[PDB]
Design a protein around this nucleic acid. Sequence first.
RNA 1: UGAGCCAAAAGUUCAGGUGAAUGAUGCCUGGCUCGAGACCAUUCAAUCUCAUGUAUGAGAUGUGAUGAUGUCGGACCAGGCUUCAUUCCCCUCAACUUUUGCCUCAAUC
Length: 1137
Amino acid sequence: RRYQLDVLEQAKAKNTIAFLETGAGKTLIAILLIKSVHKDLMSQNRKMLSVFLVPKVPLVYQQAEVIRNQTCFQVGHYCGEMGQDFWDSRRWQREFESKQVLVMTAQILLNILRHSIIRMETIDLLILDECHHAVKKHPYSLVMSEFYHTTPKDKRPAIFGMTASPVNLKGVSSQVDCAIKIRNLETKLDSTVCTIKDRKELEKHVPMPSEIVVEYDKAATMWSLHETIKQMIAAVEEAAQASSGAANLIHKLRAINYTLAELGQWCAYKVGQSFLSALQSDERVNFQVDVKFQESYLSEVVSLLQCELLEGASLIKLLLKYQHTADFRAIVFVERVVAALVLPKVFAELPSLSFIRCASMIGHNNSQEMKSSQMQDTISKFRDGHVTLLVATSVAEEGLDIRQCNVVMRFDLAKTVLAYIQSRGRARKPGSDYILMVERGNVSHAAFLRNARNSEETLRKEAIERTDLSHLKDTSRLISIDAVPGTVYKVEATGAMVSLNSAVGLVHFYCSQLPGDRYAILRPEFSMEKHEKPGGHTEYSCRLQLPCNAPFEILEGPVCSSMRLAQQAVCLAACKKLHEMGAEVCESSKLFHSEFAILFGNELDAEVLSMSMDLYVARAMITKASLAFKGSLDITENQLSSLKKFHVRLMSIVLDYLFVPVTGINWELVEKITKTLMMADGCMVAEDLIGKRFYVDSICYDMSAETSFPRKEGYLGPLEYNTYADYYKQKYGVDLNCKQQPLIKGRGVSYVLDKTYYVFLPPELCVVHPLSGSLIRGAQRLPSIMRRVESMLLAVQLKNLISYPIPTSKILEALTAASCQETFCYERAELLGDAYLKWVVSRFLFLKYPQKHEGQLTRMRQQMVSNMVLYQFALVKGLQSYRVLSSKTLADVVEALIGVYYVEGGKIAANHLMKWIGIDFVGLERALKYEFKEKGLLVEAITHASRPSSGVSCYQRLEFVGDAVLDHLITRHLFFTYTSLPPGRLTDLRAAAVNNENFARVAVKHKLHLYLRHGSSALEKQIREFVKEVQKVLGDIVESIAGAIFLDSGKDTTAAWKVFQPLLQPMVTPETLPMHPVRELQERCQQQAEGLEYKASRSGNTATVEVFIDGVQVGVAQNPQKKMAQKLAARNALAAL
RNA sequence: UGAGCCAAAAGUUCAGGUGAAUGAUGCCUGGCUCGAGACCAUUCAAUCUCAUGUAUGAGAUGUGAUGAUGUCGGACCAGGCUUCAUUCCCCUCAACUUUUGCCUCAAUC
């Protein structure tokens, strides 16, 4: 419309309020405004930040569906009703980059406004709706006030307005002037208001409904005597109040009384029937005996009334009037939800007309349940013709899709002036007709006439800017401007609102986030004591109750006269407290038991060298000792060059700083090696290598080319060889020149003997080698010796460590890579080191902060013990540079060094290495076997996170320190014993030893739970069930007792360990394998292993083993999800096998 | 050519931790709207005393209306905490299956 275009142009120039009924395309104008700001160039693309603010979740979905068709710029929407304040802030940051437009509820925006950016999120332009509904008490107005005053450079000069405002905020009839309250609102809005111009362009395509006066009800109530019975029902409700869920049942009796007076007893019978269905559901909902007795009492009273009401059993004429032509589009409204619920039942009994109703989303007394999504489904169903023909009644009159509705009749609903205008707007083009019924029973006439006249006169007068201010000057200011001045203008008001909102959010989040012992804990409570003073003002003092976890949070404030204001002042002080909480080469000869001598410039160190080193050879065990018998020995350069040439022929050629065998260096042998029909000679072949290279023990005259060669395999049917020479001719296409030539004995330089004996190689065919066979055997072992020498050099580097208590031979074992299994594995040392590191980190955290939350302390422990952080320390160490793929466990090597150091030296020395790189009660004492010097530490362990309205201390801090110390103490005992278990199996055994369930078993054995005091009844029931089971809370209390013992013992590991050692001593001796039966069945046969699916979300009724060959067996347990039932079936399978 | 074994990889079945998502919720809080109240603001109408030394002022008292606050019930609505069920993620773990790496065997080099 032309008027709508004028408001759109004005809205771009400055913030403007547009007056319309039922939108009438105002939403389209708002979409055009969003497109208009998007099209123009902006300094920052996201600076415009057009946003639509609507509190209702269904309205957000309806706005989103229209937004998708247009709004080409990316859009984001919030479902709402989710308790994730941190997630919402993270989503907002991600949304700001990803989407230009955001849609949010007003209350969620208030959460974003708390701790807002200096530019207040750079919103610049936002869309505001329901301003008329909003009042100074209402939260939406408080959200508007923060926008109304802009801290930086007029951050939000123009605000889009979707607030049509049907008449005024409220009380149009009370004000003689058209809108004194609206004038106060406009100053708070800081927005120009456009003239309504109702007939200038509007109503050209919009119909106007006409009010019709009708009788209040069809016919009249026929039960005057039953009204006296209704008074008796009220007396019965008063008796229920005297007797002292019961209140809700009393409300049901009140609802029956209201319905029977308004629509007669026949309607009341229908409400009683609906209450009877509600009674059955509420009886299932609440099992309390007192509530059930009240429900049964109510059911008997209504049932006695129902029989007479059934013998006895709205606006039927109106339904008949619109019945003609089968009109589908109609809307009806009712005073109460119960009347709407029973309206189809009333229609079915006598009119025989199908009817449906829309229940309010919020449910009172749980008579009927409406989901927000279900309400959206109901409006979508209403669009379908069949549902529209039935027609729907909603008291709320909100989020309903109704179009072309000839009848907009409203029943007993003159309470809201804006809603009356909204219903007039709702009625559409066909047969437009507003229906209002005067009531014969009560005087409903004068009030309605006055309200209608006042509303029309006020709209006409307001069709001019500042009409009220022009008409009255001082008087208008005194009546309204003085009564309702703009708020948040001063700095203090903004500070206080931000503080109250922040207080509520912070207290809820922190309390729920820490212990989490119970689903609901009343950690925060308020108690009020009257402080009324003589003076006609009355005052209240609000006590605040907080848990032992928050020591200074408790505060009492009686300064504010109002009880609510006094509570707000206490909350403001608590919020500030929450903010504070937030805040020339030596010759070396190796002797093996001719010896090989290695020339090394560095003198050998006796401590690094090992007197005895084992040789991994099956034939014999050899011990090798290396020492430098000369220092800085000088060898001639010509001799050195010959040695190098001899060494490469001796080693590099055979393999395909300088090592020379010494008998006195064998110079003559070195020279020969540097240089490197026939009849076999025994002296020549006594020691030589033959290359077609193999050692020759001797030449066998009996073996000859003439002698026949046997065929080892007949499976392939190879031709049998008449002569050994015939085999050579087949194998190599060669014939030996001499038939009687002796044949070299078969030997293998490579790592069996019978295969070498089977094949004999001719001396003429294979050339002899000067090098002796025994020297070649030493040369074969020489590369392994060289690898050992490299490890010894690495050991010299280990001695270079700044502090080492003894020669670090154990560190050399740690250096070798895990899983190579060449000699030794450091995994066992790594486990001890990891436990030591965890205990030290926990002790440091307790020192850094004594009162720090246990959950925060656990997070601090995790980051300190993280493998990646240790890996970074290893990178500075240069451990990777002893081909590293970056997935190598350098951190595990660091843990192994800590474990090796703990065995090598005292804990203080190990801590220094960590600095270098890593940086009734008497009866309880008898059962504990530990006497407590301080009673308070024992009391702290006895105190639990769950408390019966009294909190002394937090056991969480003790449990965290206790758990870490216990893990280290248990590992030390296992490590001290030489179990020699496989390292992976040892890790599983260590994990089994540190089990919360085993600690829980210890707690029941010592009756620790009985000594412990907790406020959770259900937790005690779980403890008693565990006692029945044995013939993690209990484990945590044992850790808390251990932490208290540690504080009592001055943090001495040995004293705490002596107390804890006896209980787990029986458990360690049995294997206690954690492999499990089902996993053992998989080890036996996983080739065809099938596992039965659990039946339903709840525990499956039976668990069966589907694995083949073992067969199908049934196991019974509390749940098959843990697979304990499957484990029992696997044990049955083992019995079957 | 097989068979075992020994390491790895890719899968698969686990004991577990680890987060996320979607449901089922549960709990709590704020306000809206209307009636009753009670007490404060103002004061007609009527009354009531004092003056001027007829006409009128001190003016009061107060019927009534409005404007606030504090209660008690109706009709509404939006958030915040929050848990289990399922799925998935990641990290170990008990393995298993195949290939490789790589010991054997002996034709066999």
